[PDB]
Amino acid sequence: EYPTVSEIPVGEVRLYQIADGVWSHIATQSFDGAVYPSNGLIVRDGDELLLIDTAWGAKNTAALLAEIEKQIGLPVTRAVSTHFHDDRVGGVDVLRAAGVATYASPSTRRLAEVEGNEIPTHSLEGLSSSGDAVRFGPVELFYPGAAHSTDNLVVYVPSASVLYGGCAIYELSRTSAGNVADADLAEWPTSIERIQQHYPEAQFVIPGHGLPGGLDLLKHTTNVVKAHTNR
Ligand SMILES: CCn1c(S)nnc1-c1nn(C)c(C)c1Cl
Ligand SMILES: [Zn+2]
Ligand SMILES: [Zn+2]
Ligand SMILES: [Zn+2]
């Protein structure tokens, strides 16, 4: 029942309820003539919503807000971007204009600025060292170390046992490495093991792109990254 590129028309977003008060959002974008799906997270925060990641661009992100407004009807007050690339921060301006408080680590904000990307407004302290965790309302934010990017965060929802791995975790269908331009291939397995050690109770694991699974996605990702490293 998870949405695929198949049932997502250009510029639209689908929502998927994972657990009580936790959804993913799914959008699509084209590059080099192929079409890629992309996930973020929505976490209910009392009578407000916490958003994890944009929907990969201004158009998609305005569609995301409109779909949330339609289907959940609680205000998005805060968003966290889990790394600096455009599939995670593209649309920050749209969120900012809609009165959403946008957040990221100083690591991410720095890299976004270097990249000439949109820059989340607010800074998340206490995540600069590998293994650092901070609470952010109904989630914990964890910096497991460099992996897909040097700044990548993961997000755990303790009430629902949902681990959102973002782009540091691969879906099972991906059996070769994706975009690694800014990756730390050397540290990526170590970083995944920190995630394993910190959230061994996770029941649902959501990759940045494609299908949810369980903690098997961590070892899966390790296998893929190691195979790439040894090319
Ligand atoms: C969506 C995959 N991706 C991730 S993960 N980080 N960066 C990307 C990315 N690759 N390309 C071609 C674009 C436009 C983006 Cl964003
Ligand atoms: Zn990326
Ligand atoms: Zn603010
Ligand atoms: Zn991504």
Numbering used by the authors: 32 to 262
From the paper:
BLs are categorised in two distinct families, according to their catalytic mechanism, and further divided into structural classes (Ambler’s classification): class A, C, and D serine β-lactamases (SBLs), which utilize a catalytic serine for β-lactam hydrolysis, and class B metallo-β-lactamases (MBLs), which, in turn, require divalent zinc ions for catalysis. Finally, subclass B1 MBLs inactivate nearly all β-lactam antibiotics, with the sole exception of monobactams.
High-resolution structures of compounds 24 and 31 in complex with VIM-2 and NDM-1 MBL have been determined by single-crystal X-ray diffraction at 1.60 and 1.38 Å resolution, respectively. Two molecules per asymmetric units are present in both experimental models. In VIM-2 binding site compound 24 orients the central sulfhydryl-triazole-based scaffold deep in the pocket, with one of the triazole nitrogen contacting Zn1, while Zn2 is coordinated by the sulfhydryl group. The side chain position of key residues involved in the metal atoms coordination, i.e. His116/94, His118/96, Asp120/98, His196/159, Cys221/178 and His263/220, is conserved.
